[PDB]
Amino acid sequence: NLAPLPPHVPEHLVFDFDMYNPSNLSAGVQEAWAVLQESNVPDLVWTRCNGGHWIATRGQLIREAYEDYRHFSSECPFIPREAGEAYDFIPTSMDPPEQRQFRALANQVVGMPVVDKLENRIQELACSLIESLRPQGQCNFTEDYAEPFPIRIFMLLAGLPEEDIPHLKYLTDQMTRPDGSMTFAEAKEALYDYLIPIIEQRRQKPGTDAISIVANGQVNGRPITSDEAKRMCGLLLVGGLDTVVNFLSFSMEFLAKSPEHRQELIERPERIPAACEELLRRFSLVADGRILTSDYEFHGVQLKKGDQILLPQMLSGLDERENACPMHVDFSRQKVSHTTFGHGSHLCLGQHLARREIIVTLKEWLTRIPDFSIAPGAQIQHKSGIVSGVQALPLVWDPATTKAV
Numbered sequence: 506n507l508a509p510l511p512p513h514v515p516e517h518l519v520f521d522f523d524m525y526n527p528s529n530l531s532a533g534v535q536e537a538w539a540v541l542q543e544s545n546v547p548d549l550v551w552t553r554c555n556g557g558h559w560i561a562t563r564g565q566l567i568r569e570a571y572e573d574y575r576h577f578s579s580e581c582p583f584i585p586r587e588a589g590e591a592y593d594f595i596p597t598s599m600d601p602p603e604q605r606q607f608r609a610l611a612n613q614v615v616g617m618p619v620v621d622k623l624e625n626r627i628q629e630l631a632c633s634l635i636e637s638l639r640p641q642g643q644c645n646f647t648e649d650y651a652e653p654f655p656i657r658i659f660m661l662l663a664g665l666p667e668e669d670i671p672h673l674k675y676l677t678d679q680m681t682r683p684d685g686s687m688t689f690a691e692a693k694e695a696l697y698d699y700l701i702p703i704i705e706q707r708r709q710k711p712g713t714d715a716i717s718i719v720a721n722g723q724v725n726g727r728p729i730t731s732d733e734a735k736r737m738c739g740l741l742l743v744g745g746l747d748t749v750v751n752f753l754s755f756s757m758e759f760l761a762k763s764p765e766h767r768q769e770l771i772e773r774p775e776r777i778p779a780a781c782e783e784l785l786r787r788f789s790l791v792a793d794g795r796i797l798t799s800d801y802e803f804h805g806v807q808l809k810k811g812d813q814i815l816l817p818q819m820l821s822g823l824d825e826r827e828n829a830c831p832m833h834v835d836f837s838r839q840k841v842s843h844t845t846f847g848h849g850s851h852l853c854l855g856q857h858l859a860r861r862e863i864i865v866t867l868k869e870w871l872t873r874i875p876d877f878s879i880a881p882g883a884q885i886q887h888k889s890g891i892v893s894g895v896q897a898l899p900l901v902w903d904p905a906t907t908k909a910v
């Protein structure tokens with residue numbers, strides 16, 4: 506459905522891109538979004554899809570708007586409007602100054618010191634999952650590794666039972682790639698139905714898990730409220746269940762299709778961290794945005810208070826104006842420019858955990874299964890939304906070419 510064109514929007518800026526089902530999707534989701542960077546498309550366009558909103562199509566504008574929280578507010582950060590209105594996670598639904606005091610608590614539970622506490626378990630799980638698949642000569646990568654690896658690390662960190670994964674993963678997916686059976690508000694309320702009793706249990710009887718730490722936390726020296734704790738835990742759950750999960754599949758699909766790049770990392774394993782960064786650029790996958798706090802002329806375009814603007818994190822690094830030959834993967838790329846983990850005051854606090862999970866996966870997969878390919882006659886289908894992903898990734902290999910560690 507196409508929403509009526511607002512009176513202030515000129516026809517020449519209309520480009521009806523659908524972020525939940527882009528027309529070029531069969532080419533790959535990054536490719537589908539990159540249609541917005543064809544030479545005839547303006548830096549800033551209006552789509553009538555998904556209730557109507559602006560889209561910044563170039564890194565320069567995306568960065569500028571993420572920096573300018575005074576004009577571009579995180580209050581309503583998701584499209585469609587009903588989702589952005591319902592979205593109340595902390596700290597990502599707040600602007601500075603209010604936002605900042607909550608970042609330290611989040612950092613405590615998912616940041617670098619916690620990555621250190623989890624290091625051995627991350628390593629052990631990657632190795633065990635991969636060794637279990639190795640002799641089979643095939644896997645369904647999304648279900649067999651991309652999901653269980655990061656999700657089990659998260660459930661461990663959060664002290665939540667693994668048998669709760671199917672329910673939580675379903676709900677989280679309705680917030681990022683809704684199947685239409687639940688509004689964002691309904692999925693949010695269901696997630697809160699889950700979290701509220703657990704938060705009170707852990708305020709009564711604290712453990713050492715992330716939910717206990719948030720629920721008993723202090724925010725600039727005063728106690729967090731039960732409600733604030735719930736809103737922070739919601740963000741942590743969505744980050745844990747729907748980010749790295751999708752990214753690993755883009756990366757493994759690429760490696761399955763590029764024997765040369767696999768060989769590069771096998772021969773020169775020291776390049777794996779740089780490879781991770783270049784894959785984070787090329788297979789960037791997030792697109793949220795902001796709401797205008799006032800009428801504002803931005804790059805020659807009249808924006809009105811209340812207008813939503815999608816600021817795709819994915820697009821900055823794909824912009825030829827930021828990286829030459831942007832669709833080409835070059836592990837030796839000198840300046841890897843991207844906003845994959847966001848930009849401005851809301852830079853991802855989970856990024857150290859994400860990079861560890863990625864780097865461990867690349868190392869431990871290629872150690873055991875250096876030679877693999879896409880299953881015979883398979884056509885890999887992507888999916889688009891707030892976080893984009895891979896529907897299924899069937900891989901095959903000859904077990905004789907593998908190595909048990």
Ligand code: 6HE
Nearest residue numbers: 611615744745748749752791845846847851853854855859
């Ligand atoms: C378990 C926690 C976790 C994990 C695994 C991630 N994130 Fe992070 N994240 C990302 C973006 C673009 C933003 C800013 C959003 C905005 O400005 O509105 C955040 C912010 C955040 C913030 C503020 C938090 C607490 C957060 N994200 C937890 C978080 C992207 C990512 C990506 C691309 C990955 C993985 C590849 C990721 N996150 C893993």
Ligand SMILES: CC1(C)[C@@H]2CC[C@@]1(C)C(=O)C2
Nearest residue numbers: 597743744748791793891
């Ligand atoms: C946009 C995000 C990737 C970032 C972490 C999870 C996510 C869906 C959010 O709600 C904030």
Ligand SMILES: [Cl-]
Nearest residue numbers: 596597850851
């Ligand atoms: Cl934040």
Ligand SMILES: [K+]
Nearest residue numbers: 580589590592
């Ligand atoms: K909101």
